[PDB]
Amino acid sequence: GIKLKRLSDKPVLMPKAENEWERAAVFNTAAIYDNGLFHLIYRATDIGPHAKYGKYISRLGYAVSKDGINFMRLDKPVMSNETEQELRGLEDPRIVKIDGIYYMMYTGFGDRFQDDYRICLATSKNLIDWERKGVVLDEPNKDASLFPEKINGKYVMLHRRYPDIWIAFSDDLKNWYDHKPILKPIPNTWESARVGIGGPPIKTKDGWFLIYHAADDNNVYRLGAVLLDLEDPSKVIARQKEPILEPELGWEKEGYIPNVVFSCGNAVKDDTIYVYYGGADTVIGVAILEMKDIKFHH
Ligand SMILES: OC[C@H]1O[C@@H](O[C@@H]2[C@H](O[C@@H]3[C@H](O[C@@H]4[C@H](O[C@@H]5[C@H](O[C@H]6[C@@H](O)[C@H](O)[C@@H](CO)O[C@H]6O)O[C@H](CO)[C@@H](O)[C@@H]5O)O[C@H](CO)[C@@H](O)[C@@H]4O)O[C@H](CO)[C@@H](O)[C@@H]3O)O[C@H](CO)[C@@H](O)[C@@H]2O)[C@@H](O)[C@@H](O)[C@@H]1O
């Protein structure tokens, strides 16, 4: 069925030894195509992103490309660890643009107590200057994004009350209602342990195309695909049984976290989806899917 095609056998972005904030790893990047350019807001750590390596701090960098493969990168992070909720940094951003404003949801990792991580919101007009809007849901949660437009006059968000993908609605982004689970793990498969969104969903004629990730019982992360109904995105029209992307290359299989492909961003240019993904929580790669190749067996 659906399979992402890698544009390169090499990463499109790698850590940079000269800059402490991105010395160890760059991964799990937001992505958006705007004004003729691919833009990445990428997660970066000073240390390998696991407790076994040390007290890593995640910050958000900016990179830009004309072709979606060769990137230029800014020397400093566009968002750094500023609040108490962000003591251990900002993780796994997802960005959409609605009416001239970029809405970035990210995980603020505090680690002051058990499950001290929260979905936070920041907005920008330019992807460089970010204004914090605070915690979105005051509960242990992550893997969140707005839909790229309002549905029936309402903001809609995906989130992940472990281990399932959830949806919720809001008039003003301040209070949320109609919480319901939309996607769950399937036992004795590649997607048994947990699920979560990839990048933000993409609107097509047949429905909302949503890339999701899942872990198996050996903690191998892969990507999958689902189609949601346009008017009621809680309804799953189709879900592909097989993954669309798996760890295959050396920099996907080996790194700080072995056997991981993980996406927080899918940019669109001329009916081609550019899916950016972290490899082994260490580097960033890219793989494509043409709109016309979005075909579900059901
Ligand atoms: O966003 C922060 C951080 O998230 C990372 O991934 C998430 C998660 O991280 C670990 C931890 O997750 C715990 C729990 O951890 C397991 C184990 O649990 C303890 C105890 O905490 C539980 O209460 C108890 C069950 O009642 O079991 C105990 O054994 O602790 C181990 C050591 O810390 C850890 O290896 C085990 O995975 O796992 C459950 C799901 O199974 C989580 O819901 C729960 O939050 O969270 C802390 C921060 O609070 C982290 O420091 C730990 O690394 O790991 C999950 C997979 O196991 C993953 O799904 C979560 O996303 C990374 O994404 C990282 O990059 C990021 O900085």
Curated annotation (Swiss-Prot):
This chain's source organism reads: Thermoanaerobacter sp. (strain X514)
UniProt enzyme class: transferase
- What protein am I looking at? 1,2-beta-oligomannan phosphorylase
Q: Which GO terms describe its biological process?
A: GDP-mannose biosynthetic process
Regarding pH, the record states: Optimum pH is 6.0 for phosphorolytic activity. Optimum pH is 5.0 for the synthetic reaction.
Q: In which pathway does it act?
A: Nucleotide-sugar biosynthesis; GDP-alpha-D-mannose biosynthesis
Keywords in alphabetical order: Carbohydrate metabolism, Glycosyltransferase, Transferase
Family of this protein: Belongs to the glycosyl hydrolase 130 family.
Q: Which InterPro entries match?
A: Glyco_hydro_beta-prop_sf, Mannoside_phosphorylase
EC number annotated for this UniProt entry: 2.4.1.340
Q: Which reaction does it catalyse?
A: [(1->2)-beta-D-mannosyl](n) + phosphate = [(1->2)-beta-D-mannosyl](n-1) + alpha-D-mannose 1-phosphate
Subunit and partners: Homodimer.
